[PDB]
Amino acid sequence: LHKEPATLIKAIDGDTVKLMYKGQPMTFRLLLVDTPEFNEKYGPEASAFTKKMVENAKKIEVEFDKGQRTDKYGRGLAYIYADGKMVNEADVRQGLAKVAYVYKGNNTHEQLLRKAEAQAKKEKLNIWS
Numbered sequence: 001l002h003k004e005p006a007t008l009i010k011a012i013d014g015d016t017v018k019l020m021y022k023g024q025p026m027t028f029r030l031l032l033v034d035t036p037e038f039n040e041k042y043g044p045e046a047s048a049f050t051k052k053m054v055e056n057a058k059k060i061e062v063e064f065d066k067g068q069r070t071d072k073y074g075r076g077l078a079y080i081y082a083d084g085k086m087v088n089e090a091d092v093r094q095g096l097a098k099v100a101y102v103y104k105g106n107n108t109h110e111q112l113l114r115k116a117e118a119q120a121k122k123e124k125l126n127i128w129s
Ligand SMILES: Cc1cn([C@H]2C[C@H](OP(=O)(O)O)[C@@H](COP(=O)(O)O)O2)c(=O)[nH]c1=O
Pocket: 029, 030, 031, 032, 033, 034, 071, 072, 077, 101, 103, 106
């Protein structure tokens, strides 16, 4: 898998973000994760956390997996990095997202994220408190 450039347009919620990719605006849905909706418990904290991460970044990158790159709603599907650190992983590590929506072909970083979920759960963090 390969990292490609993109720039923040705007933070949306815990697991979606609007980025400019190859010079076009698109909404990205983070692969392999599910944050609570803003309206739910930990939803605001998940939104704040992703927002801070992407807004503080000097360099945003997007990394497509091997499978589908767009979902049925036209959202890009990717791993998103902020100054070299994966947002998808960090959301899970902090107990602000669950590993979710694991579809064969688009699941390269499954193991890595499940490891982070286990540590988050052991610490009883946020969603696991
Ligand atoms: C993360 C992800 C979501 N989706 C779809 C499945 C869900 O369909 P439904 O909307 O029919 O439930 C929806 C969940 O995204 P949200 O968690 O953003 O709602 O997006 C994909 O198709 N592929 C993916 O990799």
